[PDB]
Amino acid sequence: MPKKTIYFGAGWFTDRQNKAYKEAMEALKENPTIDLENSYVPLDNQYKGIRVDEHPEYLHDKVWATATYNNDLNGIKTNDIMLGVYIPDEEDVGLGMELGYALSQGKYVLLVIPDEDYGKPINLMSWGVSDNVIKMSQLKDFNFNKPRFDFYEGAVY
Amino acid sequence: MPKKTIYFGAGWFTDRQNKAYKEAMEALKENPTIDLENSYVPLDNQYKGIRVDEHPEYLHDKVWATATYNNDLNGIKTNDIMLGVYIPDEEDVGLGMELGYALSQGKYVLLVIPDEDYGKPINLMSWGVSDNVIKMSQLKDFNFNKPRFDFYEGAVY
Amino acid sequence: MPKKTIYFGAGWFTDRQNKAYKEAMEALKENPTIDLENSYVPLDNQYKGIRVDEHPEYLHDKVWATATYNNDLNGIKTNDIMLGVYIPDEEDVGLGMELGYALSQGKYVLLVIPDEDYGKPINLMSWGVSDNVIKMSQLKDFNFNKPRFDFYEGAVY
Amino acid sequence: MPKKTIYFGAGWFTDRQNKAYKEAMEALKENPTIDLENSYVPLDNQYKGIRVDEHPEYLHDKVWATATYNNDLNGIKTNDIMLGVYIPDEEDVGLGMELGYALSQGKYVLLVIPDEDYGKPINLMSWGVSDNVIKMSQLKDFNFNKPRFDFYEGAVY
Amino acid sequence: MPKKTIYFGAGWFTDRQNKAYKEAMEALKENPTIDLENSYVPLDNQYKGIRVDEHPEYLHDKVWATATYNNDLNGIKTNDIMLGVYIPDEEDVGLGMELGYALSQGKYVLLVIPDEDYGKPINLMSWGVSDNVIKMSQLKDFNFNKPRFDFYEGAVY
Amino acid sequence: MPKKTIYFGAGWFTDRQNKAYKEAMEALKENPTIDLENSYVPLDNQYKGIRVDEHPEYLHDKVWATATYNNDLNGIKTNDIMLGVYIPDEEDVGLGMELGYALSQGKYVLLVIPDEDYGKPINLMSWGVSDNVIKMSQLKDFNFNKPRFDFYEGAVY
Ligand SMILES: Nc1ccnc(=O)[nH]1
Ligand SMILES: Nc1ccnc(=O)[nH]1
Ligand SMILES: Nc1ccnc(=O)[nH]1
């Protein structure tokens, strides 16, 4: 079985983001086409091991910002697939940027929306950058070796 | 004396977006290094003239969405400079994507934040994609012929 | 008032190619948004002046081929706009490649089809690379300062 | 043994194209450096499973065209190697475009020409985009783990 | 009549660098196809005005280095043409990098070698990145509106 | 254990370059995250098997130069990781270019400096293109499956 690596594109700044984050991670553990061990998870790759939520002194540190921004870009570019955990009511400017960068690096761009939200309107530009969008409950079985383009079954705004 | 064109990256949903929109447009009218006539303004480039406010059925039409998404991308890629009107309290996933695309297309990426908001925290990836971020009040006089790299004087989360 | 440069993507082998070539060139002479003097016209940029019709031995010379191929690429990349004179009954693998390169270099990609042929089926990938496809008769007046995305009004196989 | 995936660049619109198509597919089955199971074959990845030759109603459907064009681009970008089954007397504008896109995505670009045709002149731009070109009868043994640049043993036009 | 901007890729450490620097600058002043005012000259764009000769402590500051590196990249990407003042006996790893970046950004890449040095061996990769290499004495009159591909008349190691 | 391939970026034109070359190669033999067999080593991939140091007749051969330049680019683009064996006192314009090309191809860019030299100032642009820089003695154990961004522990100039 060939396995692909991913970049774990996900916000961690609301309750629904954190729920979706936890679910997507569990799905990837169970997906046999994914090497999660060798995938890039931003939250474990922040500069110096520090997160600005737990250490607000780094809010103005430009070294921390430079290194953590660069590590994320590096995580996208050196992994096979771009994953975006996407909350339609709570869309993330950071993830938006990362989607655009992933496009520029020739990565498959897959959005995953919580089942409770799948079908709701999403930003036109998210719709467009995406190669495909699926429900959280499809993530454990998604075949990352044969990724295809498909349209969201949903509206844009 | 030489003038550059821009893509007008700006939301139009909320009150603060519309205020900033109006201000940024006024600033560009007054900036002698900008050819606004030949710049790309999304709101004046709605596909086939269809107005989605008066016909929201087109938000489920894949052709409408494809052409609108493509027009935006096209507007970024065929103009000199990427302008992002950025509201820190109302950060936009669509703008985020556009910023990343502009980076990939080799464009100068300039964010403009309302003076009332300049200093407030912005997403790390917005900070990083940007080549520079300035206050609305500096847009009138920004020299687009000699665009330089600088850091936001502000917080980043 | 501002003028853009183009790469003149057009075959010169067949009768229909040469007719379309002559027409497109005439249209560009008359278009006020085009600087034709500073555009790249392959046929006037033959390497070292060597004329391959009168010296076909150079078709086996790797240096001749390297420089000619590179000049074409260079002409696309250093000009504003990619123009493809496209004959639906005589589709050209070389033009196809040039279109893809122009896409990769962030250029507006405009196809022009003779009015007698506009509507006839074109290759799916030609349809897709293109930002727009127009009739020869619209080239005279095309505004290259405000190039927009649109779909071919025609069939695609 | 490491294996690479490919995009199966090949026309299917003439008798010689179909012959070459069949031969190249058989060669890939036998090549131990290729994972054919996880490779992208356009003809099995058309939108909705439908081919326009067998269902000409889709000749004007822009949804079908959008999705099938996008899936092909996605197939090139997410696979390791670009393969072009190339008939020198019957060159394909679609494949031409795909070669250019593959170049932009940093893929090895390999042309395969039927033995009966190998040596015949090929389009200059095909010659140039290519990293290498081989005979159909070399395809079963080509080592895709160690792909190198070489010149066609043949003319251009 | 139309003028193009450049990035002034040139070292300033050695005597030969400084001689060539002075000469190339003089040539560009006299070239009517160049807008030197709006070109990017590193030495006039030192970050925050800090002069590293008088304050070498900033060579250990990561913020200084980040901004300076980014300014250079920005200067290449937002100008029309990449100019590399190249000394064959004193080849520069930094210039090498800048050349590669300019290639990636779709810029014409022109090397200029002092006439006393034109013909001397240059690195294979310098030879290859370049679209053209000329003598200092030809810079005054180089037509930057019609930049063409050609080979160095000289040795390459 | 997943393995990655590399491009062996290294000069071979001084005694210290050759020492570092030999050491880096030995380190890669011992690194279990590297497939060295399928990696690209320039010195074994020169056109026709010939090196210009041992056959100076090829110093003016443009065919040799074209093919060997193109093979190196191909070696960077088809391998997972860009390695630069870097001597701070003896920096290489060729490697500089290759670093820039590797950046454009989305590759992890890793510099390796002899332990005797690690800490010495390096060119600003080398510092910036790099994703990370390590000592020769770290190379045998570097985990290429989880490559991260880090700052050089050293100065620039
Ligand atoms: N604090 C952060 C914001 C966005 N992305 C990150 O990786 N970290
Ligand atoms: N009908 C088609 C033409 C070209 N390419 C395809 O994948 N399909
Ligand atoms: N002679 C050479 C110089 C640079 N790079 C190479 O691969 N070969």
Numbering used by the authors:
A (entry chain A), B (entry chain B), C (entry chain B), D (entry chain A), E (entry chain B), F (entry chain A): 1 to 157
What does the paper say about this structure?
A major challenge in the further development of nucleoside analogues for therapeutic applications is access to scalable and environmentally sustainable synthetic strategies. This study uses the type II nucleoside 2′-deoxyribosyltransferase from Lactobacillus leichmannii (LlNDT-2) to prepare a suite of ribonucleoside analogues using naturally-occurring uridine and cytidine sugar donors. An enzymatic alternative to the use of NPs to prepare ribonucleoside analogues is to use nucleoside 2′-deoxyribosyltransferases (NDTs). These enzymes catalyse the formation of nucleoside analogues via an overall nucleobase exchange much akin to NPs. However, NDTs are mechanistically distinct, forming a covalent adduct within the active site, thus controlling stereoselective nucleophilic attack of the incoming nucleobase on the β face.
To gain further insight into how the presence of a 2′-OH substituent on the ribonucleoside donor influences substrate recognition and subsequent catalytic steps, structural studies were conducted on the wildtype LlNDT-2 and a double mutant Y7F/D72N. To explore the structural implications of the differences between the two enzymes, WT-LlNDT-2 and the Y7F/D72N mutant were both crystallised using conditions determined for the WT-LlNDT-2 enzyme previously. Complexes were obtained by soaking cytidine 8 into the crystals. All structures contained two molecules in the asymmetric unit, constituting one third of the hexamer routinely observed in solution. In the case of WT-LlNDT-2, electron density in the omit maps obtained could be clearly modelled as the ribosylated intermediate, and the cleaved cytosine nucleobase, whereas in the Y7F/D72N structure cytidine 8 was intact, presumably reflective of its poorer kcat as observed for CtNDT. By contrast, the ribosylated intermediate of CtNDT reported by Tang and co-workers features the ribose flipped approximately 90° from this position, with the 2′-OH interacting with the side chain of D62 (D72 in LlNDT-2), despite the conservation of most active site residues, although the authors report multiple conformations of the ligand in this complex, evidenced by ambiguous electron density. Therefore, despite previous studies highlighting that WT-LlNDT-2 ribonucleosides are poor substrates, this can be overcome by increasing the enzyme loading.
